[PDB]
Amino acid sequence: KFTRSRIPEKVFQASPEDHEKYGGDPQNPHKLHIVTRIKSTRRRPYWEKDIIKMLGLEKAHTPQVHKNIPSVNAKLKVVKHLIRIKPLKLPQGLPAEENMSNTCLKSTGELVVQWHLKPV
């Protein structure tokens, strides 16, 4: 019978080669995930549909910010084959109330807090 899949824990234990490849240090892990649904929930189990709805990824190619905490990670593990997960990067730090209206999420995963739309 087709059932929910239990991913072995060793799958989510990064190696030094993976760290070098993906540019993420095991120490000081990133705080937030940018998650984009890149796959349809159609032809997938109702539990995956429900997990996608819970994560708020109903619209495809629409980035959503989530906490990098074990429970959210468990949900993302459940629906990992339908989503792209990247680390949210804050080159200028967290946006402040002053610049809250000038933010933009660049394709690189960086949430720049100044968006002038002018050449550098």
Partner: protein, 205 residues
Amino acid sequence: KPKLRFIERAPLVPKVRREPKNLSDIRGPSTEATEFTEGNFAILALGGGYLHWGHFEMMRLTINRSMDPKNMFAIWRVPAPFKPITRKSVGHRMGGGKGAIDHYVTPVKAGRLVVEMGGRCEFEEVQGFLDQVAHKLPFAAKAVSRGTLEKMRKDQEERERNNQNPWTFERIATANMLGIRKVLSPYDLTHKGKYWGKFYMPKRV
């Protein structure tokens, strides 16, 4: 008694209760009779299948005729047919209950030894008729010595180690990447894609 022993058509005490055709006994790798015991050569089953009394007679007659009793000895590594297969009367419509026991078979899984030979002989002396028997067997089979079996196992291990493909069936199935477990079977998590029904793909890594 070096010559191969006679095998009865059915167990002396016939089974009375019909039992289901659990094809899992043919499916997957063999976990029994996988290693040599009191012999140096054998017929290895590279696939799953049921051996009938006809197959047993073929093996016995061919091996007995082609062997040298004073220098070679043979022994069965598969039990006599015990699993009952039932057939309905010809032209019967579906339904009306399970059919009566027709024949007895013995299941064989891929990677099992069917007959094992030994004695004061080398491979080339036996490989001929062993290969004849293997080719006439109902499943893919190969005449294999201890050395050749170890060589093929080591070659499989070497291919698994040195394969340049970043992606392996084992990895993808275990991680459920792409959600392929929707298409795969729970048995595939252990078969690692090397087995498909009763067929064993040896080139598969």
